Design a protein that fits this description.
- InterPro entries: AKR (IPR020471), Aldo/ket_reductase_CS (IPR018170), NADP_OxRdtase_dom (IPR023210), NADP_OxRdtase_dom_sf (IPR036812).
- The chain has ten helices and ten strands.
- The longest helix has 15 residues.
- The protein has a single domain, classed as Alpha-Beta Barrel (TIM Barrel), CATH 3.20.20.100.
- The chain has an eight-stranded parallel β-sheet with strand order 3-4-5-6-7-8-9-10. A two-stranded antiparallel ribbon has the order 1-2.
- The chain is α/β, with parallel strands linked by helices.
- Helix 2 links the parallel strand 4 and strand 5.
- Bound molecules: NADP nicotinamide-adenine-dinucleotide phosphate (NAP) and ligand ID5.
- NADP nicotinamide-adenine-dinucleotide phosphate binds next to helix 9.
């Protein structure tokens, strides 16, 4: 396997990164420190995760120790939905930079294609529980993202949770300055994303797979819901390789030429999840895992399904 993938800006992105959603502030500093010690050099962050200060604490220190150089790290963050207005984007980026204690990001993503009413609340809802949109559009937000590159705050920009028509909207802009470098999307054996991956890869956009373990800690998970980590078929593939099910689930997107960002705050799991460069899934394993697709999406909200830019009404 090679360990980084080339982006359109000429930078190389590590194919394995550490996710940080639901890594509690009081626990994430140690998580990130351990991750850097064991070899992670890509960290996936976001303003909405409410922990960027504590991630930043960890990074800055591993600099203070001389454990890693900033140029070796690949730090990703994301513009939250309440900041899609062109005049709010730079301040949102700068807040993330200040929290992370960094002078640039390697990649900055539009977190979702949906703009929400600006304000303090991450999820402004009306009295009936529907998200309150903003009067923003993908192209104007993208133009504001491009200014961040031209000001040196971020090295690359991309998107997350965009369907292929939303990607196309950006690509087709006459005055496009920067193509998206990455589309970060949910991807795992129960939601294999064959058509969107094919589309993105054909357009020279790198795909990052989020929730590769099925996000078992997501707050809306129902006890009856499928569980990747407990799937006995995946356990049997893992046993054949004397690996864990998590290790199989991480290796799987890597062999599809995807980037993958498993989350853990547990030191013993952070280290296990990185030990995926010493084995390969066979062609039969890959085919088998792909065959588990059920088009089963875990990361979506009912409250957002009426937004004009809700991404998941389209087939892909
Ligand atoms: N762009 C977006 O809209 C978006 C959406 C979702 C996710 N993401 C990103 O993708 C990252 C990964 O997705 P995710 O956090 O949803 O879920 P995930 O990585 O699929 O699963 C994380 C869960 O698996 C557990 N776990 C980790 N390693 C394990 C192992 N070796 N054995 C058993 N359990 C293990 C974790 O527990 P502990 O932490 O307690 O160890 C945690 O509960 C996020 O953290 C975030 O950075 C982005
Ligand atoms: O982002 C993470 O890592 C994990 O996710 C989350 C992370 C957080 F820190 C808080 C909430 C979520 C969450 O509720 N996620 C589900 C969504 N679905 C939608 C949706 F369908 C939209 F059309 C717009 C939108 F913005 C969302 S957010």
């Amino acid at each position: 396997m090679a360990s980084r993938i080339l982006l359109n800006n000429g930078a190389k992105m590590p194919i394995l990164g550490l996710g940080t959603w639901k890594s509690p502030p009081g626990q994430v500093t140690e998580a990130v420190k351990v991750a850097i010690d064991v070899g992670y050099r890509h960290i996936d962050c976001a303003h909405v995760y409410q922990n960027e200060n504590e991630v930043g604490v960890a990074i800055q220190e591993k600099l203070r120790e001389q454990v890693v150089k900033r140029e070796e790290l690949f730090i990703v963050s994301k513009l939250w939905c309440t900041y899609h207005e062109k005049g709010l984007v730079k301040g949102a980026c700068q807040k993330t930079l200040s929290d992370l204690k960094l002078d640039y990001l390697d990649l900055y993503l539009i977190h979702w294609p949906t703009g929400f009413k600006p304000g303090k609340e991450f999820f402004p809802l009306d009295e009936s529980g529907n998200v309150v949109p903003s009067d923003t559009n993908i192209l104007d937000t993208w133009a504001a993202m491009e200014e961040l590159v031209d000001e040196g705050l971020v090295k690359a920009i991309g998107i997350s949770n965009f369907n292929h028509l939303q990607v196309e909207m950006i690509l087709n802009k006459p005055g496009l300055k920067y193509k998206p470098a990455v589309n970060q999307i949910e991807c795992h054996p129960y939601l294999t994303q064959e058509k969107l991956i094919q589309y993105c890869q054909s357009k020279g956009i790198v795909v990052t797979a989020y929730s590769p373990l099925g996000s078992p800690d997501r707050p809306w998970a129902k006890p009856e819901d499928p569980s990747l980590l407990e799937d006995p078929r995946i356990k049997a593939i893992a046993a054949k390789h004397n690996k864990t099910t998590a290790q199989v689930l991480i290796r799987f997107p890597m062999q599809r030429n995807l980037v993958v960002i498993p989350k853990s705050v547990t030191p013993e799991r952070i280290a296990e999840n990185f030990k995926v460069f010493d084995f390969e899934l066979s062609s039969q394993d890959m085919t088998t895992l792909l065959s588990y697709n059920r088009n089963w999406r875990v990361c979506a909200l009912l409250s957002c399904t009426s937004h004009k830019d809700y991404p998941f009404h389209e087939e892909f």
